[PDB]
Design a protein around this nucleic acid. Sequence first.
DNA 1: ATCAGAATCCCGGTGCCGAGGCCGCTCAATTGGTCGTAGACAGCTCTAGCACCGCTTAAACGCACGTACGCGCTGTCCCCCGCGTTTTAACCGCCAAGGGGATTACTCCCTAGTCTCCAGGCACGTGTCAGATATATACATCGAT
DNA 2: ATCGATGTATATATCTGACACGTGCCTGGAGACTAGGGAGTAATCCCCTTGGCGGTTAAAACGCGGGGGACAGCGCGTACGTGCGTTTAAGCGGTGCTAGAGCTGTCTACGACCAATTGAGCGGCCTCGGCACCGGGATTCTGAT
Lengths: 95, 95, 90, 92, 78, 78, 96, 104
Amino acid sequence: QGWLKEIRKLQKSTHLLIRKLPFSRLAREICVKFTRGVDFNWQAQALLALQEAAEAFLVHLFEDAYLLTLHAGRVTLFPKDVQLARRIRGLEEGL
Amino acid sequence: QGWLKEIRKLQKSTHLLIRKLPFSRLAREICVKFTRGVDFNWQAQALLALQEAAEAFLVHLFEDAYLLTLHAGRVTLFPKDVQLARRIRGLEEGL
Amino acid sequence: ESYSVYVYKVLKQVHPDTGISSKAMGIMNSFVNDIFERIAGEASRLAHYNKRSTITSREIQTAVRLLLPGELAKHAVSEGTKAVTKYTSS
Amino acid sequence: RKESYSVYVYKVLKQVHPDTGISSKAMGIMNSFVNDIFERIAGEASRLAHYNKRSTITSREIQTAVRLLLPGELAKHAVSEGTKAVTKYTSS
Amino acid sequence: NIQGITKPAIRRLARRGGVKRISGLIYEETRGVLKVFLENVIRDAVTYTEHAKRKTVTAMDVVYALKRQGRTLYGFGG
Amino acid sequence: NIQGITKPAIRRLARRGGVKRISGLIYEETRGVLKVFLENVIRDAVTYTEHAKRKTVTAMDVVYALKRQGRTLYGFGG
Amino acid sequence: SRSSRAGLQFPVGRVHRLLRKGNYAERVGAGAPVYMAAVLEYLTAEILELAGNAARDNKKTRIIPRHLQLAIRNDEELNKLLGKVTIAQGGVLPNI
Amino acid sequence: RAKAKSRSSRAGLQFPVGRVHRLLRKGNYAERVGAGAPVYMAAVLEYLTAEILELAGNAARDNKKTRIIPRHLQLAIRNDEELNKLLGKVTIAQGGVLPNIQAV
DNA sequence: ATCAGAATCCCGGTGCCGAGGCCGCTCAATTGGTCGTAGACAGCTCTAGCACCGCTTAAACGCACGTACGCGCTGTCCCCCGCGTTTTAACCGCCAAGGGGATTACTCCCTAGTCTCCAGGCACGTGTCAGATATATACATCGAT
DNA sequence: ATCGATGTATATATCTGACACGTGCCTGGAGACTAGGGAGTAATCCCCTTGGCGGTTAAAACGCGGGGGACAGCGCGTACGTGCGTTTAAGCGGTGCTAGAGCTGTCTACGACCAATTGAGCGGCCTCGGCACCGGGATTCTGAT
């Protein structure tokens, strides 16, 4: 029953769940496409602000998709639930 | 299969589906509670603007709730689906 | 310039023994600034709809009754209408 | 006198489709659409000039507001239309 | 008098939304969500009306209430 | 580098969200959702950064780029 | 005519007056109403061309707001620009 | 000259009236700003600040802390229903999601 | 696949009324010219972002395995759609009153603007104590020996 | 699952660093005066909203019957959580460079601001043709067999 202890522990802590360096390299990889090949510098608080926003969006999408999962009469999340919550939330709230 | 002919005939047309006079009485009954007892007048275009907005809101909510219904393995729309569409639709875009 | 002095003054009025951290103070500065921009922009478009040039206390009172929910919009306009009526006495 | 955008929506309509017309209600839709997009682009440029400690809405804030608000293909054509019009206007 | 939002009208709204079958408990909740929507938009339109020195809820007050709540309406005001 | 968002990290985000069980197809769909979200935020932040005459994406540019999308983020822009 | 100078059909003087009397900023440049009216004219040309095609597909020589809704909701990007708006007297795009 | 009484002192407030007057004037909200609007605005901001600071102090006393961290600000905002509608579109940095492991 | 029988568009009349073209007028935009200041722009300081190295070491990962659960099938049984007759209230067309939107004209008083002081708030600096761990003690709380 | 092991709240013990109180300083806010226009306020015209009545007639309502579908039960079998050994890359902690943020100082194009003038655009008015409705052709789907 380690999922109950894990959910009960992760819903108390406030630390970032995605590790900071591969999220930084992901943000560099996405940022170099919109700058037409030139590389930009990032402030240290810019990546932390982006990581807080991305992780909060991901946990809110996961609780919405789990409401959809319990609507379907199951407990496992299937990506059809995340894909459905992205279009019930809208075109800019779920995207 | 009269439901299919009814769905296509209602999706072709643009006319207001709710009748104008009972919706007008509902809008005035709701309005008299907020105006501190003294009755207010409504313009002829105000009741039509509110009725177009309420009609478009109810059709969009029924589209979202029917997506949830087809997610649950059903074809009958159930009030739990409209409740869940309002819940995962947000605090701003729902209700 | 930030709202750190006033959030701390309000905090020591409300809870006299508690304190606030630096990151929570940044939350409070951002919260005060965001509610300021929302109420001021709503009063701005309220003055723009009626072809007026002045943001009075009526425009702020209407923007508070629009933006805030029902329970808060009956307390905030009490605080505002007590503060302005105190201020005009001077 | 109540100013509207009905004449220019008609001029643009005649240019794109010289045989069609617009109803009164669908001219109200377009006259409200232009006003809504004008309010959005100018408010975005307004807060964009407020961020950078500037007082002037020049063409950079309008172009950046267009790039912020619009989607990917519409932005790339709308900034081309805007830069072409600004170059044609300043070449006079 | 929300029972004037009749059962075939709620059925017509659901059939415009593409709903094939409708349970019998939909009609008492559609008349709750419609009441909540009206008690938001009419409250904001009455606030916009009472801010001016008016006693008439115009089409502009409803359009501005709806634009305040994020759902812009076109073709009535502007 | 999108595989650097590892399966334990996605599972930790889902367990924070309250999810009891997770299929194996969530990890390749959550990475696409994170790609789309970071593209939408980083495009606006790079647009704000390029609008100023700067080559460094600051912290305020992310906060403004999120308040653009309607998701406000308190704690960095004040 | 300033609008004619920029090769546009939307007005640059009315857009400059709405930018100056709209409280957006302390000062408004010269090319900002030109750029603004060009963007508005392009967006109006795009949605009117799609509405004209949607009206000609219905074999009508006149645009009613049903055709504007069929123009917005069928196009992918104008549906992202006009996602949270409601076209009056425009029926929902057919789907099931 | 008489002694300089600040405008937030005569209104019985703690948030500044002169600073919010300068922010309303230089903010391009309107070309003219009245006198009672900064007093009203500062009173509303001082009420909303004391309204989430009281619930934050309550959640810090419930966590047995004598100091407010933004986790307590999240627990204060997401628990009261009016502030959850006022701050629905607001992400609190370094704030954990409210504990809701649903009983299905 | 075959039926007779509803169900959909396609040519032709008929007519209403609203779009569109045209005109007079008036006000808002165009044209010159001034002039004060915001922004382009060089020059310089110095913060902090990037890059690297080396060592931990906690987290990721591969593999296997049991079992919880997804999913397809099936059987009662409720209860929603369709149909037919009532029946009732929305709606259209008149008609008439009058409340209140909207405009104008006068006029005060409120708020921008400026100049001068000076006290509130910010940057910096430093003690000290709240909180993060740490680790043996006592207390619930059940799952696997 | 009658107790035994197992996770979990008390509790004192360091210990670091971040909060909070203090000081010096400066620029932003308060006081006092002017002065011009925006908004308060009465007066009036006329729209347009409400209210009423009477017929009609389309839509709502009631009830009945049947068949679709919700939902509970169950079994097969896939795939997910868990445990454990292995491996790897994130994180710390230092260090060193330099790109670029940020600040200052000069100056020049640029946009606000007046006046005079007039053409673009708004209100109103009239006509005509697009569209709504209707009527048979001609075809083209739909349950029962």
